[PDB]
Amino acid sequence: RPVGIVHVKVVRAVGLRKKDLMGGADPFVKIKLSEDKIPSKKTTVKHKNLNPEWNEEFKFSVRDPQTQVLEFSVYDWEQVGNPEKMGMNVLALKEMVPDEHKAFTLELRKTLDKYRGKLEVELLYKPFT
């Protein structure tokens, strides 16, 4: 049974790597909560943009907050074929207090180097009682 909901705002990314022949990249972000079988969330694609701003908000059913971890994956949408990874990071749900607007800045890495940019996110945890 779920014990709370976390509110994730994907704010912006800064300093992404060029991944297209021209235009930079077409970034979007995939957000997955660990220990879960729900479809991951994806932001809008920000075509031809190496400093995209989304300010996009998602929410996730928390089952246990010291265990579960948020996975943020930044991909470059392709006109042909599948999007190509641009970097990822994780963020632990133990890193917050309920009812407080907490921001973070995650560095993008190949897996959990060459500066791959930053992803700014905000989290707000709210439990039931």
Phi then psi for 97, rounded to 5 degrees? -125, 145
Q: Nearer Cβ to Cl ion, position 17 or 47?
A: 47
Q: Which residues bind Ca ion (CB under 5 A)?
A: 19-20, 26, 76, 78
**Cβ atoms < 10 Å from Cβ of 83:** 19
Binding flags for Zn ion, 8-47, as an x/- string (CB under 5 A):
-------------------------------------x--
25 touches Cl ion by CB under 5 A: no
- Residue 9 in contact with residue 109, Cβ under 8 Å? no
Which one among 6, 13, 16, 45 touches Cl ion, defined by CB under 5 A?
45
Q: Which two tokens stand for residue 27?
A: 């970034």
Q: Which residues of 15-111 form beta strands (DSSP E)?
A: 27-33, 41-42, 53-62, 69-76, 84-92, 102-107
Nearer to Ca ion, 8 or 42 (CB): 42
CB closer to Zn ion, 51 vs 61: 51
Burial class (CB in 10 A: 0-12, 13-18, 19+), 87: buried
Shortest separation between residue 47's beta carbon and Zn ion, angstroms? 6
Among 38-46, 69-77, 94-102, 116-124, the segment contacting Cl ion (CB under 5 A)? 38-46
What residues line the site for Zn ion (CB under 5 A)? 45
